[PDB]
Amino acid sequence: MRIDLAQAFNESLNNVVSEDPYTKSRHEAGRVEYARMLELHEKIGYVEIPKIEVKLPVYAGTSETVLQKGVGHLEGTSLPIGGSDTHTVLTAHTGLPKARLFTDLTKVKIGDTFYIHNIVETLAYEVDQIVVAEPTQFEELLVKPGQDYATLLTCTPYMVNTHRLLVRGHRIPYVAEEH
Template sequence: MLKKVFRFLFSVCLIVLGIGMSLYPAVRSEKIHMEAISYQKEVDNAYKQNKEQKKKKESDPFYQSIKKYNEDIYKNGQKDFKDAFSYTWFPIPLNGFKEERCGYIKIPAMDVQLPLYVRATKKNMAKGATVLGNTSLPIGGNNTNSVIAGHRGYQGSPYFREIEKLQIGDKVYIKNQWEKLTYIVKRIKIVYPNDSDEVKIQPGKDMVTLLTCHPYRSHGRYRYLVFCERDTSKKAVKKKKAVIETKDKTITYEPSEPEIKKENIIKQIAGFFILFCIIFLLFNNLFFLIKRQFYKKNKDSPNF
């Protein structure tokens, strides 16, 4: 009897584990998506409230401190932007950003919308896109370049996994509590991880630079950079296929699409296998119960 109970409980545990494993990526991805929507509403409400109250950013002390920070790092040549530690540090208080979120980023060509965090810590990068410390905070303005980093996929959530879908002319949107900013993809380049000079502020430009690892699932062998410049014209922009630049001849562009497709196929096969195991265990236990009832009925039947 104990053996039968143990067998049943073991089967139930396997079924629950299988369902959990197959659903976890989707559940986590949906959780991130819902958090992004929730935070988007917070930002939209703050933006709307500031607009209705005719609250000018010029009179907001917190905005002015950010603007001064952006000006200062340009003047000093971003001298503190040099290693992984500097990416998580800002020399000014950022208490005006709730839970270190400074807005959200929307990239239609990649079909992603993510909360935008200041400080590129592991914790923040697990929750969304992050602004590297000692780069411009994303409020726009001349002589700025906000470097925005994202994982190349993380625990089932895509994040910047599909970054290679971006082409010249694609738009990137950033919204904070003061305004909506629109940027257009201008250049794409692959560099080494320590090439920090590649993402520094370019004089006279208002930019954001998207940054992630490359190739996909390469453990960060290179960095994939998408340079975007501010668009205030609101005119339609003709898109064109990007020419992928590289730091030098030692780097060759390796498309990530085959690896992403391969991973998706493996996930589908794994999903079907888990589903098969669940169905097998269910039918096996059902057959066992029917068989048991059949023998019990025959045993209890009178003999003529």
């Protein structure tokens, strides 16, 4: 995952997009990078949730290759590199016998902290909203302009899976002098 390209990509989603020829070519290039990551189920990094003791590898896309061995990045959402005008969504199974994965996401509270570890940095998010939505309801996963969110997403209730659990955090400062 080239960072300049992940950024190009992330800029290409958000509300106001420029009609300029240089910008169009940059957005395209970003799109070609994400497709290549998708083609290769490429590892992006890790998500860690300390209070449920989760630390899982994150991969590009939500293919079953990915979802069988770790966490998947929802195609259509920002790459997990942070920044204003970003909203990344990381997804995993609940109630898969093979691995626990996101099963204990139901135990996450508002005020709790999760981290996304990429090749550049640890990013810290503080849970500010938990929503149980229908599988085709996307209104809470969208890019909120000028802002920086990450949602962890899973099937719900346990082994029923009629709904999705949307656990959302806003970006907070990460002081390594602590975590």
